[PDB]
């Protein structure tokens, strides 16, 4: 009882931070995979009504030329930090002449993760998935509103992430190429989805050093459908 939010618990620990993890459950489920050749990720659009335009809301955004991203939880708070880091990657490309590394993007947002200031009055419950290709090749990063940074070979968020991470680590392949990652992505996809698969139900994100960007292109989702 009498939860003091950022002020600690009688036990104790933070509470709303845990409630920010619950704010990931209400969002769409995105399942990322990092491979030697590239990084593949998929998320369901979850169209409520046919009035909804498929490209209106997308969970995959581009922070930098070589940096992809996958948002989570709330949207407006995501695009805030998204467009923010896009300016941060722009200033990093000026003074240092080189594009900002996917590594430093984390700690840039991690400092402002929980401000307890005017933003971050109420904190933002938006999780962020950082993909891209740094000097070390394709990488996939995961972070939370509390500011945790852990490098994950395959990471899932959203609603079904509970049951998604179950079958994920079992069929995951670290040393294989993107060739198996293609069919390995649709496996967990068709599992968690209770409805027929179409280009407007989900969206695919695949970024590779040699093939890019890409990102993704139009009408490559229905190609994966008929490839089953």
């Amino acid at each position: 009882y009498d939860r003091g939010v950022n002020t600690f618990s009688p036990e104790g620990r933070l509470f709303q931070v845990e409630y920010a993890i619950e704010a990931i459950k209400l969002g769409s489920t995105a399942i990322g995979i990092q491979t030697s050749e590239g990084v593949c990720l998929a998320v369901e659009k979850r169209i409520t009504s046919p009035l909804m335009e498929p490209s209106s809301i997308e969970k995959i955004v581009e922070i930098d030329a070589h940096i992809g991203c996958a948002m989570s939880g709330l949207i407006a708070d995501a695009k805030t930090l998204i467009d923010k880091a896009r300016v941060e990657t722009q200033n990093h490309w000026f003074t240092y002449n080189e594009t900002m590394t996917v590594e430093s993007v984390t700690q840039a947002v991690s400092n402002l993760a929980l401000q307890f200031g005017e933003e971050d009055s109420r904190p933002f419950g938006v999780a962020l998935l950082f993909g891209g290709v740094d000097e070390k090749g394709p990488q996939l990063f995961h972070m939370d509103p509390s500011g945790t940074f852990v490098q994950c070979d395959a990471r899932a968020i959203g609603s079904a992430s509970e049951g998604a991470q179950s079958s994920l680590q079992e069929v995951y392949h670290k040393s294989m190429t993107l060739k198996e990652a293609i069919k390995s992505s649709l496996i967990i996809l068709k599992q968690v989805m209770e409805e027929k698969l179409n280009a407007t139900n989900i969206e695919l994100a695949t970024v590779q050093p040699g093939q890019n960007f890409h990102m993704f292109t139009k009408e490559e989702l229905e190609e994966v459908i008929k490839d089953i």
Binding site: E62, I63, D83, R86, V87, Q90, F94
Partner: protein
């Protein structure tokens, strides 16, 4: 210091001398006064070298950030507004910006000339420099909007040759880029030493 740019049937031709010296003392002949802002755009360098470098890098800031979130076509009226107003804040503080905004508009070819004093206009031909007064005589007399790209390579460097022939600050390598619908295309880099025998017969 001789810089000239003109729009014609295909894109815009940008030609400028690479000689940057102090007085009559030869210092650096490799200084590039033609800057590439984007693969589809072309910048220039005049007056303050770091001035036109910063603002074009500051212009590339807003342009690239606006490209990420959108990838929508950006009009030059957006580049004229923000840039000229931010430079006008520094008017009278010693900053000199003589660059000429170049690129390819989706509609058709276009050319823009920018000044630190706030002078910005869109016209066919703009040439600024010491020997640029000798450029207007040879170019504008035989200049035409229908000239071929092959003739644009000869006429532009000819005005550079008429300038860089005898001049204090003019010389070095001629940077020539040809703008098309897909952006600029690198043509050649030729030193004035090669311009001597080529255009003199």
């Amino acid at each position: 210091t001789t810089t000239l740019a003109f729009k014609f049937r295909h894109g815009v031709i940008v030609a400028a001398d690479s000689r940057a010296t102090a007085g009559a003392y030869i210092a650096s002949q490799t200084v590039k006064k033609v800057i590439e802002i984007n693969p589809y755009l072309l910048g220039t360098m005049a007056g303050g070298a770091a001035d036109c470098s910063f603002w074009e890098r500051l212009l590339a800031r807003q342009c690239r950030i606006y490209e990420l979130r959108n990838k929508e076509r950006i009009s030059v009226a957006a580049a004229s507004k923000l840039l000229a107003n931010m430079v006008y804040q520094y008017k009278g503080m010693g900053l000199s910006m003589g660059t000429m905004i170049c690129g390819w508009d989706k509609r058709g070819p276009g050319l823009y000339y920018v000044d630190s004093e706030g002078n910005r206009i869109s016209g066919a031909t703009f040439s600024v420099g010491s020997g640029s007064v000798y450029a207007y005589g040879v170019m504008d007399r035989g200049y035409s909007y229908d000239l071929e790209v092959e003739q644009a390579y000869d006429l532009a460097r000819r005005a550079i040759y008429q300038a860089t022939y005898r001049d204090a600050y003019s010389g070095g390598a001629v940077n020539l880029y040809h703008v098309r619908e897909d952006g600029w295309i690198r043509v050649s880099s030729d030193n004035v030493a090669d311009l001597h025998e080529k255009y003199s017969g």
